[PDB]
């Protein structure tokens, strides 16, 4: 029994992409991922705010 076909695809409000700048790609991403973790670290009492600590 073929009920429906594609109901959730085209019926979202089709939000297009915003504008950003590029990532550093290659080695400089590793320089960033090192400095973002182990250089300007904040001393943390329980380490509960993860890398995507989003409320």
């Amino acid at each position: 029994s073929l009920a429906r076909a594609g109901k959730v695809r085209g019926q979202t409000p089709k939000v297009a992409k915003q504008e950003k700048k590029k990532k550093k790609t290659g080695r400089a991403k590793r320089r960033m991922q090192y400095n973002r973790r182990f250089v300007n670290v904040v001393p943390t009492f329980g380490k509960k705010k993860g890398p995507n600590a989003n409320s």
């Binding site: 076909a5 594609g6 085209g10």
Partner: protein, 628 residues
């Protein structure tokens, strides 16, 4: 179950499949095939196709031409093969789509420094959507550069073409021996059997003569001399030419082949008793003078304005599902007269033989579509009718064409002629599943006047767009949704699936711009479309499971008219209305959950909808296409 007997079974299966393949290869091109026909499409502007065709031309040539176009016959007994080349310009959408639906191998010529061009891109998306018979790519300027830029140019071509043509090699043309290699290639190639063409019988038009009945009539005997490439064309059947409608013919005859593989007599007549005839529609037509009733009961730029209002309505019907602002002066039960609510849209019944218009008296409804189609295709396949076979160089004397057809052929436009299967000229209700190309971003509303190519036809029409579900009730869409696949529906001649569904729209002065593309679903009027209307509200008094809502009606007895129809709620709640209270639009409503203050109470109303009657057959002549 052994080493030998199972290898023997492999031998039997190889014999069966090789016999099938050598059955289907010899009967296409050669001493039985009509010719093998190749159409030629360049894409860019830098291609000088006279230089291409004069490299390509040589064997023995037999040079026809037309008023503008120049097709010709090519014959070589060295390969024992007939080619028939025919050149085309991209952008000439009428000519290319009319003779690549009857072409048999498409040769794309390409510039070396890039892939497609935009006019060629347009024609390429059209030819993708109506079915490629066989593509074979080619380039022309590769010998003019030494090895460095030559190799890198081929790599840039295979990168710029493998985002559209994913796997093919680029057979270059510089020398006439490259033309020999190309012809050896196009002789042996797996023909994609296009399923539409083989289920009918179609002639090309190699030569056209005309004899009028009277010259002031502008009607007369047409004389199409050409080969037959489909089934056995029967003579009692009808005939259609793709540009100028459908019309019944008088005389078939077989003159000799003007151009063999190596160097007035008729076989059949009309008789009109068995010959099916042109019935396009159903051929049957003491109270006081003072006091009230109360105490007596105690007794240029307007087009851009239209465009921007369409973008406004696509915002207001695509941010929102089908929200409708309410009327205010007219009694809101009258303007929504023929609306009734369903409890559930999937389940609750709706009689398909209930409210049929005066134009549903003028259609032919199939009772069982699938078995009638099986019976017709079964008579096509395993039978033999009395008409001429494939390959026969025949002329048709067609009784009833006009003269401008002949003049358009003398311009250089190609004529085709395919017969109809039984019940293919009568009008009924056609259902096309269809999606939208991301080439055009123009809004396409419901009853926009569009142009269809539903299976070798060409006609203006006015559809209604729908959800594509395999249920009973299907929703009306109010705009062409840019990413779903929808179902358009039109009064139109009936055509047996499969068939490709092209749609394009007049931009300005014959600039047919492609919008929609798809295939042909089940054709029957029984598929009724349901148009929905959402009436909005606001819950300005909120109690436990009971709420007073305004701004949905404005009378009082409107609520007495829309009483059994259940409400619903964007937060999911499924209640239905109790008594009204106000003389203005106000009502109390029971519910199941508690009602948020951030709510929008809204009900749904439905009717049956059906397309308009426009089957104007003539299509205006397209112009060369250009970039926006």
């Amino acid at each position: 179950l052994s080493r030998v007997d199972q290898r023997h079974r492999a031998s039997q299966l190889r014999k069966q499949k090789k016999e099938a393949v050598l059955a289907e290869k010899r009967q296409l091109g050669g001493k039985d095939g009509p010719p093998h026909q190749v159409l030629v499409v360049p894409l860019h502007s830098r291609i000088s196709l006279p230089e291409a065709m004069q490299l390509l031309q040589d064997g023995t040539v037999h040079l026809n031409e037309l008023g503008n176009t120049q097709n010709f016959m090519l014959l070589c007994p060295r390969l024992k093969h007939r080619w028939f080349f025919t050149s085309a310009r991209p952008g000439d959408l009428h000519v290319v789509l009319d003779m690549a639906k009857v072409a048999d191998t498409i040769l794309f010529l390409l510039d070396p420094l890039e892939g497609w061009d935009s006019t060629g891109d347009y024609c390429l998306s059209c030819l993708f959507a109506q079915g490629l018979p066989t593509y074979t790519l080619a380039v022309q300027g590769i010998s003019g550069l030494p090895l460095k830029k030559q190799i890198d140019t081929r790599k840039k071509l295979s990168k710029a073409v493998e985002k559209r043509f994913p796997h093919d090699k680029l057979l270059l043309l510089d020398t006439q021996q490259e033309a020999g290699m190309l012809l050896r290639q196009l002789a042996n190639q797996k023909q994609q059997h296009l399923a539409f063409r083989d289920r009918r019988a179609y002639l090309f038009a190699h030569a056209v003569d005309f004899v009028p009945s009277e010259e002031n009539n502008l009607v007369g005997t047409l004389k199409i001399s050409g080969y037959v490439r489909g089934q056995t064309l029967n003579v009692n059947r009808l005939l259609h030419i793709v540009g100028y409608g459908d019309f019944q013919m008088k005389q078939i005859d077989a003159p000799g082949d003007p151009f063999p593989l190596n160097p007035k007599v008729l076989m059949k007549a009309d008789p009109g008793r068995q010959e099916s005839l042109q019935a396009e529609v159903i051929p049957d037509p003491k109270v006081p003078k003072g006091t009230s009733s109360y105490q007596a009961e105690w007794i240029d730029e307007e087009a851009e304005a239209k465009m921007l209002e369409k973008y406004k309505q696509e915002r207001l019907e695509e941010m929102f599902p089908d929200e409708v602002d309410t009327p205010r002066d007219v009694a809101a039960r009258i303007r929504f007269q023929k609306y009734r609510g369903l409890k559930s849209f999937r389940t609750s019944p709706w009689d398909p033989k209930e409210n049929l218009p005066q134009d549903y008296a003028r259609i032919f409804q199939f009772q069982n579509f699938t078995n009638t189609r099986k019976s017709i295709f079964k008579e096509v396949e395993e039978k033999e009718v009395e008409g001429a076979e494939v390959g026969w160089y025949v002329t048709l004397h067609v009784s009833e064409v006009p003269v401008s057809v002949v003049e358009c052929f003398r311009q250089g436009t190609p004529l085709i002629a395919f017969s109809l299967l039984p019940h293919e000229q009568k009008m009924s209700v056609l259902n096309m599943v269809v999606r939208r190309d991301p080439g055009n971003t123009e809004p396409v509303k419901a009853k926009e006047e569009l142009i269809f190519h539903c299976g070798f036809r060409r006609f203006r029409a006015s559809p209604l767009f729908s959800q594509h579900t395999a249920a009973d009730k299907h929703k009306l869409q109010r705009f062409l949704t840019a990413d779903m696949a929808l179902v358009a529906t039109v009064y139109a001649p009936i055509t047996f699936p499969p068939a490709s569904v092209l749609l394009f729209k007049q931009k300005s002065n014959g600039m047919h711009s492609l919008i929609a593309t798809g295939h042909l679903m089940s054709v029957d009027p029984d598929r009724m479309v349901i148009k929905r209307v959402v009436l909005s509200g606001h819950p300005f008094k909120i109690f436990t499971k009971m709420a007073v809502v305004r701004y949905m009606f404005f009378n009082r007895e409107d609520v007495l008219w829309f009483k059994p129809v259940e409400l619903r709620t964007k937060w999911g709640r499924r209640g239905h209305i109790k008594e009204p209270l106000g003389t203005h639009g106000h009502m109390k409503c029971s519910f199941d959950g508690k009602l948020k203050s951030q709510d929008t109470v809204l009900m749904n109303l439905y009717k049956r909808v059906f397309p308009k009657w426009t089957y104007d057959p003539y299509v205006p002549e397209p112009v060369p296409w250009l970039k926006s």
